[PDB]
Protein backbone atom coordinates (compact mmCIF):
# COMPACT_ATOMS: atom_id res chain seq x y z
CA UNK A 1 0.00 0.00 0.00
CA UNK A 2 3.05 2.66 0.78
CA UNK A 3 6.42 1.82 -0.39
CA UNK A 4 5.90 -0.14 -3.64
CA UNK A 5 3.36 2.34 -5.04
CA UNK A 6 6.31 5.04 -4.45
CA UNK A 7 8.98 3.31 -6.15
CA UNK A 8 7.00 2.50 -8.72
CA UNK A 9 6.02 6.62 -8.86
CA UNK A 10 9.40 6.95 -8.82
CA UNK A 11 10.35 4.65 -11.52
CA UNK A 12 7.88 6.45 -14.09
CA UNK A 13 9.52 9.30 -15.16
CA UNK A 14 12.81 7.81 -16.53
CA UNK A 15 10.88 4.73 -18.34
CA UNK A 16 8.78 7.25 -20.00
CA UNK A 17 11.86 9.32 -21.07
CA UNK A 18 13.60 6.31 -22.24
CA UNK A 19 10.70 5.04 -24.26
CA UNK A 20 10.31 8.14 -25.92
CA UNK A 21 14.13 7.77 -26.81
CA UNK A 22 13.92 4.40 -27.93
CA UNK A 23 10.93 5.48 -30.41
CA UNK A 24 12.89 8.31 -31.86
CA UNK A 25 15.45 5.48 -32.36
CA UNK A 26 12.95 3.43 -34.10
CA UNK A 27 11.79 6.09 -36.53
CA UNK A 28 15.24 7.21 -36.89
CA UNK A 29 16.27 3.95 -38.14
CA UNK A 30 13.27 3.82 -40.33
CA UNK A 31 13.94 7.22 -42.03
CA UNK A 32 17.93 6.47 -42.23
CA UNK A 33 17.37 3.52 -44.15
CA UNK A 34 15.00 5.10 -47.12
CA UNK A 35 17.38 5.27 -50.25
CA UNK A 36 15.87 6.38 -53.97
CA UNK A 37 16.73 3.53 -56.16
CA UNK A 38 17.78 5.08 -59.45
CA UNK A 39 17.12 2.62 -62.53
CA UNK A 40 18.99 2.30 -65.89
CA UNK A 41 17.66 0.96 -68.73
CA UNK A 42 18.82 0.10 -72.38
CA UNK A 43 19.77 2.81 -74.12
CA UNK A 44 17.21 3.54 -77.08
CA UNK A 45 20.30 4.73 -79.53
CA UNK A 46 21.60 1.13 -79.80
CA UNK A 47 18.26 -0.17 -80.75
CA UNK A 48 18.31 2.20 -83.67
CA UNK A 49 21.60 0.81 -84.39
CA UNK A 50 20.30 -2.19 -84.38
CA UNK A 51 17.37 -1.16 -86.17
CA UNK A 52 20.11 0.25 -89.12
CA UNK A 53 22.38 -2.75 -89.21
CA UNK A 54 18.80 -5.07 -89.98
CA UNK A 55 17.81 -3.14 -92.97
CA UNK A 56 21.74 -3.85 -94.48
CA UNK A 57 22.62 0.06 -94.67
CA UNK B 1 35.83 11.35 -110.56
CA UNK B 2 37.75 11.42 -113.54
CA UNK B 3 36.19 8.16 -115.77
CA UNK B 4 33.11 8.31 -117.82
CA UNK B 5 30.73 5.93 -115.46
CA UNK B 6 28.91 3.37 -117.37
CA UNK B 7 25.50 4.26 -115.41
CA UNK B 8 23.65 7.36 -114.33
CA UNK B 9 23.19 7.20 -110.69
CA UNK B 10 19.34 6.86 -109.85
CA UNK B 11 17.56 6.36 -106.49
CA UNK B 12 17.63 3.24 -104.87
CA UNK B 13 14.09 2.92 -104.30
CA UNK B 14 12.90 -0.55 -105.74
CA UNK B 15 10.84 -1.48 -102.59
CA UNK B 16 8.35 0.95 -104.17
CA UNK B 17 5.78 -0.50 -101.71
CA UNK B 18 7.01 -0.73 -97.55
CA UNK B 19 4.18 -0.16 -95.73
CA UNK B 20 5.00 2.28 -92.43
CA UNK B 21 3.37 0.06 -90.30
CA UNK B 22 5.56 -2.99 -91.14
CA UNK B 23 8.82 -1.50 -90.45
CA UNK B 24 7.59 0.23 -87.34
CA UNK B 25 6.43 -3.19 -86.45
CA UNK B 26 9.52 -4.89 -87.03
CA UNK B 27 11.36 -2.04 -85.05
CA UNK B 28 9.32 -2.47 -81.91
CA UNK B 29 9.93 -6.44 -82.11
CA UNK B 30 13.65 -6.08 -82.46
CA UNK B 31 13.13 -3.70 -79.89
CA UNK B 32 11.33 -6.00 -77.63
CA UNK B 33 13.48 -8.55 -78.17
CA UNK B 34 16.90 -6.04 -77.22
CA UNK B 35 14.89 -5.00 -74.39
CA UNK B 36 14.56 -8.38 -72.82
CA UNK B 37 17.98 -9.94 -73.43
Given at each position: ?9 N?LP ?44 | ?15 S ?21
Open positions: DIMVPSFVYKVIHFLQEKRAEQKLRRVLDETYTEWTEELDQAHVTDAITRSLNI | ISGVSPLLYFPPTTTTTNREDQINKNTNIAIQMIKR
